[PDB]
Structure 1
Amino acid sequence: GSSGSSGMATTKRVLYVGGLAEEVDDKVLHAAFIPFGDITDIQIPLDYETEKHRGFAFVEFELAEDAAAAIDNMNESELFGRTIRVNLAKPMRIKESGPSSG
């Protein structure tokens, strides 16, 4: 049994981790997800003024299957004495400001 609502895509490698701690970083997440498979790259949400994170990040998996397995597990897992959430990366959405109809 299976089905695709969202649509058609193969971007099931980048996982979204939430509920992270103030000490958790790309490094902590790496050695924390290194078991599942072989992380290809990691991204951390930071600013240009403070360059700090709110409590989440995005991890990539060498494969898709490995990622799915990481979610089913890491999902509502226990990290640093906290409950983090894991799920497929949400669909981004950007825009551009410009003059219209004049």
Structure 2
Amino acid sequence: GSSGSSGNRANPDPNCCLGVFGLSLYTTERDLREVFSKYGPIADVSIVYDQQSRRSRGFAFVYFENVDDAKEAKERANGMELDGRRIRVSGPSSG
């Protein structure tokens, strides 16, 4: 016998890292940070912009305090209605 396991990680997976894709036309760190602030305390927010168009590029990076602190949103962020425009959320491992 001696057969029984569940599975547990060791190293701090990048899970925490939270990223948003397909954002609204005019989206500033303020709006997002505010929309997410509801979930909990945020660490920092950095939205990518374009060089030509004076509007958000379409992708942003949201960092939280801890992993679990992010999951809260990572689950309540995917395909969420924001300012009429729906945004998506992801979180790979290799970047």
User: TM-score normalised by the shorter chain: which range applies?
Assistant: 0.7 to 0.9
- SS at 1:70 equivalent: helix
- Which of these residues, 37, 42, 60, is aligned with residue 45 of structure 2? 42
Q: Is the 8 A contact 1:58 1:89 kept in 2?
A: no
CA distance in 1, matches of 2:24, 2:93: 20
Deviates more, 1:83-92 or 1:24-33: 83-92
RMSD: 2.6
- Give 1 or 2: higher strand fraction: 2
> Shift in Å at residue 54 of structure 1?
1.2
TM-score (norm 1): 0.70
1:85 aligned onto 2:95? no
Number of equivalent positions: 89
Indicate yes or no: 2:18 matched with 1:15. yes
User: Is 1:75–2:85 an aligned residue pair?
Assistant: no
Task: Show structure 1 runs of 5+ residues with no match.
Answer: 93-102
Q: Percent identity?
A: 34
Write out aligned runs for 1:44-59 (5 A).
44-47=47-50, 49-50=51-52, 52-59=55-62
Normalising by the residue count of structure 2, what TM-score does the alignment of the two structures yield? 0.74
Q: CA deviation at 1:85?
A: 0.3
Q: Per-residue CA shift, 1:79-98, capped at 9, x if unaligned?
A: 01121101115633xxxxxx
Listed as ranges, the gaps of 5+ residues in structure 2 are 1-5
Q: Higher helix share goes to which structure?
A: 2
Q: What whole-Å deviation, never above 9, does each CA across 1:61-101 have from its counterpart, x for those lacking one?
A: 11111211211111111001121101115633xxxxxxxxx
**What is the rounded CA distance, in whole Å, between the counterparts of 1:78 and 1:35 in structure 2?**
15
The runs of at least 4 aligned residues of structure 1 exceeding 4 Å deviation read: 1-4, 49-52
